[PDB]
Design an enzyme around this catalytic site. Structure first.
Site, PDB file in Angstrom:
ATOM      1  N   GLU A  35       0.862  -1.330  -0.016  1.00 24.45           N
ATOM      2  CA  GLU A  35      -0.025  -0.056  -0.072  1.00 24.45           C
ATOM      3  C   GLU A  35       0.793   1.260   0.038  1.00 24.45           C
ATOM      4  O   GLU A  35       0.716   1.974  -0.829  1.00 24.45           O
ATOM      5  CB  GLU A  35      -0.952   0.144   1.056  1.00 24.45           C
ATOM      6  CG  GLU A  35      -2.504  -0.810   1.011  1.00 24.45           C
ATOM      7  CD  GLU A  35      -3.326  -0.476  -0.047  1.00 24.45           C
ATOM      8  OE1 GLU A  35      -2.907   0.426  -0.758  1.00 24.45           O
ATOM      9  OE2 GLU A  35      -4.453  -1.243  -0.055  1.00 24.45           O
ATOM     10  N   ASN A  46      -7.838   9.574  -5.923  1.00 26.70           N
ATOM     11  CA  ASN A  46      -8.340   8.937  -6.870  1.00 26.70           C
ATOM     12  C   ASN A  46      -9.153   9.659  -7.779  1.00 26.70           C
ATOM     13  O   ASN A  46     -10.127  10.267  -7.313  1.00 26.70           O
ATOM     14  CB  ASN A  46      -9.124   7.656  -6.280  1.00 26.70           C
ATOM     15  CG  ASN A  46      -8.474   6.794  -5.524  1.00 26.70           C
ATOM     16  OD1 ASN A  46      -7.680   6.129  -6.264  1.00 26.70           O
ATOM     17  ND2 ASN A  46      -8.503   6.859  -4.022  1.00 26.70           N
ATOM     18  N   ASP A  49     -13.052   9.112  -8.725  1.00 26.41           N
ATOM     19  CA  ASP A  49     -14.066   9.217  -7.893  1.00 26.41           C
ATOM     20  C   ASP A  49     -13.937  10.126  -6.543  1.00 26.41           C
ATOM     21  O   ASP A  49     -14.963  10.298  -5.859  1.00 26.41           O
ATOM     22  CB  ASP A  49     -14.510   7.630  -7.455  1.00 26.41           C
ATOM     23  CG  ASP A  49     -13.646   7.357  -6.006  1.00 26.41           C
ATOM     24  OD1 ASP A  49     -12.851   7.994  -5.770  1.00 26.41           O
ATOM     25  OD2 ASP A  49     -14.309   6.374  -5.409  1.00 26.41           O
ATOM     26  N   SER A  51     -11.986  10.695  -4.333  1.00 22.54           N
ATOM     27  CA  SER A  51     -11.810  10.269  -2.762  1.00 22.54           C
ATOM     28  C   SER A  51     -10.182  10.078  -2.672  1.00 22.54           C
ATOM     29  O   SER A  51      -9.693  10.090  -3.535  1.00 22.54           O
ATOM     30  CB  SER A  51     -12.388   8.823  -2.499  1.00 22.54           C
ATOM     31  OG  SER A  51     -11.802   7.733  -3.155  1.00 22.54           O
ATOM     32  N   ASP A  53      -6.888   8.132  -0.354  1.00 18.12           N
ATOM     33  CA  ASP A  53      -6.243   7.131   0.325  1.00 18.12           C
ATOM     34  C   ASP A  53      -5.244   8.056   1.181  1.00 18.12           C
ATOM     35  O   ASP A  53      -4.264   8.563   0.706  1.00 18.12           O
ATOM     36  CB  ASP A  53      -5.715   6.209  -0.279  1.00 18.12           C
ATOM     37  CG  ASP A  53      -6.744   5.559  -1.495  1.00 18.12           C
ATOM     38  OD1 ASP A  53      -7.869   5.566  -1.230  1.00 18.12           O
ATOM     39  OD2 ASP A  53      -6.176   5.189  -2.461  1.00 18.12           O
ATOM     40  N   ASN A  60      -9.288   4.510   2.745  1.00 23.51           N
ATOM     41  CA  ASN A  60      -9.883   5.761   1.847  1.00 23.51           C
ATOM     42  C   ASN A  60     -11.042   6.397   2.716  1.00 23.51           C
ATOM     43  O   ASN A  60     -11.680   6.254   3.610  1.00 23.51           O
ATOM     44  CB  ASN A  60     -10.595   4.900   0.797  1.00 23.51           C
ATOM     45  CG  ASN A  60     -11.473   5.463  -0.244  1.00 23.51           C
ATOM     46  OD1 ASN A  60     -12.600   5.800   0.101  1.00 23.51           O
ATOM     47  ND2 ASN A  60     -10.551   6.139  -1.459  1.00 23.51           N
TER      48      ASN A  60
HETATM   49  C1  LIG Z   1      -9.325   0.233   3.072  1.00 26.82           C
HETATM   50  C2  LIG Z   1     -10.551   1.271   2.366  1.00 26.82           C
HETATM   51  O1  LIG Z   1     -10.632   1.922   2.664  1.00 26.82           O
HETATM   52  N1  LIG Z   1     -11.062   0.239   1.734  1.00 26.82           N
HETATM   53  C3  LIG Z   1     -12.052   0.622   0.675  1.00 26.82           C
HETATM   54  C4  LIG Z   1     -13.505   0.086   1.015  1.00 26.82           C
HETATM   55  O2  LIG Z   1     -13.796   0.088   2.343  1.00 26.82           O
HETATM   56  C5  LIG Z   1     -14.539   0.586   0.138  1.00 26.82           C
HETATM   57  O3  LIG Z   1     -15.723  -0.496   0.117  1.00 26.82           O
HETATM   58  C6  LIG Z   1     -16.813  -0.215   0.863  1.00 26.82           C
HETATM   59  O4  LIG Z   1     -16.652  -0.184   2.117  1.00 26.82           O
HETATM   60  C7  LIG Z   1     -17.785   0.268   2.626  1.00 26.82           C
HETATM   61  C8  LIG Z   1     -17.707   0.335   4.230  1.00 26.82           C
HETATM   62  O5  LIG Z   1     -17.104  -1.139   4.671  1.00 26.82           O
HETATM   63  C9  LIG Z   1     -19.004  -0.846   2.455  1.00 26.82           C
HETATM   64  O6  LIG Z   1     -20.134  -0.694   3.293  1.00 26.82           O
HETATM   65  C10 LIG Z   1     -20.788  -1.658   4.119  1.00 26.82           C
HETATM   66  O7  LIG Z   1     -21.227  -2.433   3.522  1.00 26.82           O
HETATM   67  C11 LIG Z   1     -21.471  -3.661   4.543  1.00 26.82           C
HETATM   68  C12 LIG Z   1     -22.205  -4.766   3.372  1.00 26.82           C
HETATM   69  O8  LIG Z   1     -22.971  -5.392   4.193  1.00 26.82           O
HETATM   70  C13 LIG Z   1     -22.592  -3.102   5.468  1.00 26.82           C
HETATM   71  O9  LIG Z   1     -22.731  -3.944   6.543  1.00 26.82           O
HETATM   72  C14 LIG Z   1     -22.279  -1.843   5.927  1.00 26.82           C
HETATM   73  O10 LIG Z   1     -23.490  -1.174   6.405  1.00 26.82           O
HETATM   74  C15 LIG Z   1     -21.664  -1.030   4.876  1.00 26.82           C
HETATM   75  N2  LIG Z   1     -21.376   0.418   5.290  1.00 26.82           N
HETATM   76  C16 LIG Z   1     -21.747   1.761   4.784  1.00 26.82           C
HETATM   77  C17 LIG Z   1     -21.060   2.890   5.461  1.00 26.82           C
HETATM   78  O11 LIG Z   1     -22.401   1.717   3.738  1.00 26.82           O
HETATM   79  C18 LIG Z   1     -19.192  -1.033   0.816  1.00 26.82           C
HETATM   80  O12 LIG Z   1     -20.157  -2.046   0.561  1.00 26.82           O
HETATM   81  C19 LIG Z   1     -17.800  -1.326   0.237  1.00 26.82           C
HETATM   82  N3  LIG Z   1     -17.992  -1.196  -0.799  1.00 26.82           N
HETATM   83  C20 LIG Z   1     -17.759  -2.236  -1.877  1.00 26.82           C
HETATM   84  C21 LIG Z   1     -17.809  -1.839  -3.610  1.00 26.82           C
HETATM   85  O13 LIG Z   1     -17.154  -3.187  -1.530  1.00 26.82           O
HETATM   86  C22 LIG Z   1     -13.981   0.583  -1.389  1.00 26.82           C
HETATM   87  C23 LIG Z   1     -15.095   1.286  -2.162  1.00 26.82           C
HETATM   88  O14 LIG Z   1     -15.636   2.400  -1.727  1.00 26.82           O
HETATM   89  O15 LIG Z   1     -12.897   1.429  -1.207  1.00 26.82           O
HETATM   90  C24 LIG Z   1     -11.912   0.877  -0.570  1.00 26.82           C
HETATM   91  O16 LIG Z   1     -10.664   1.612  -0.972  1.00 26.82           O
END
Ligand SMILES: CC(=O)N[C@@H]1[C@@H](O)[C@H](O[C@@H]2O[C@H](CO)[C@@H](O[C@@H]3O[C@H](CO)[C@@H](O)[C@H](O)[C@H]3NC(C)=O)[C@H](O)[C@H]2NC(C)=O)[C@@H](CO)O[C@H]1O
Ligand SMILES: [Cl-]
Ligand SMILES: [Cl-]
Length: 136
Positions: A35, A46, A49, A51, A53, A60
């Site tokens: 990383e 990024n 989008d 955002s 890191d 993120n």
């Molecule tokens: C290290 C880092 O920052 N990685 C980033 C990922 O976290 C991010 O993925 C999205 O993460 C969020 C938070 O975990 C996901 O939302 C959660 O999803 C679960 C699924 O059931 C749910 O229980 C939670 O309520 C929900 N939280 C919120 C706040 O909505 C989200 O689904 C992830 N998205 C994907 C596509 O997997 C990604 C994408 O933004 O970025 C990484 O850099």
């Protein structure tokens, strides 16, 4: 700060990362290596989008810290800043806050899969090399 490999391994061990939510210390080491190259001041915008890191773990801004400048977000409660931190906190030389935030990250369902770098470079690989001879 740019950490030396074993210095980081011992730091992470002290901070309770070994086996946290089922992830070995070696996996965390692999993650930080790919990383940021173990650099706490690392930032990556990024353009795709809007955002950013931050830090050694490249956390993120869309869901984990507040930088004020991250659009695509409908914030429910703490949903846009789940670590309860200014993104600035992820750029300090002391990694305590970064570690607390990484721990919060893995509390969500995806766990360690939250990092694309981990999927590509660490998953199903021999990660023992990252901790060999560090005394952890
Ligand atoms: C290290 C880092 O920052 N990685 C980033 C990922 O976290 C991010 O993925 C999205 O993460 C969020 C938070 O975990 C996901 O939302 C959660 O999803 C679960 C699924 O059931 C749910 O229980 C939670 O309520 C929900 N939280 C919120 C706040 O909505 C989200 O689904 C992830 N998205 C994907 C596509 O997997 C990604 C994408 O933004 O970025 C990484 O850099
Ligand atoms: Cl803060
Ligand atoms: Cl803030």
């Amino acid at each position: 700060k740019v950490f030396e490999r074993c210095e980081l391994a011992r730091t992470l061990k002290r901070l309770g990362m070994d086996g946290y939510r089922g992830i070995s210390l070696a996996n965390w080491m692999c993650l930080a290596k790919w990383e940021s190259g173990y650099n706490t001041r690392a930032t990556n915008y990024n353009a795709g989008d809007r955002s950013t890191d931050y830090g050694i773990f490249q956390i993120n801004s869309r869901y984990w810290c507040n930088d004020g400048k991250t659009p695509g977000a409908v914030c429910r409660g703490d949903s846009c800043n789940a670590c309860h931190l200014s993104c600035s906190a992820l750029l300090q030389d002391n990694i305590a806050d970064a570690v607390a935030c990484a721990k919060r990250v893995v509390r969500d369902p995806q766990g360690i899969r939250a990092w694309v770098a981990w999927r590509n470079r660490c998953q199903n690989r021999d990660v023992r090399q990252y901790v060999q001879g560090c005394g952890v």
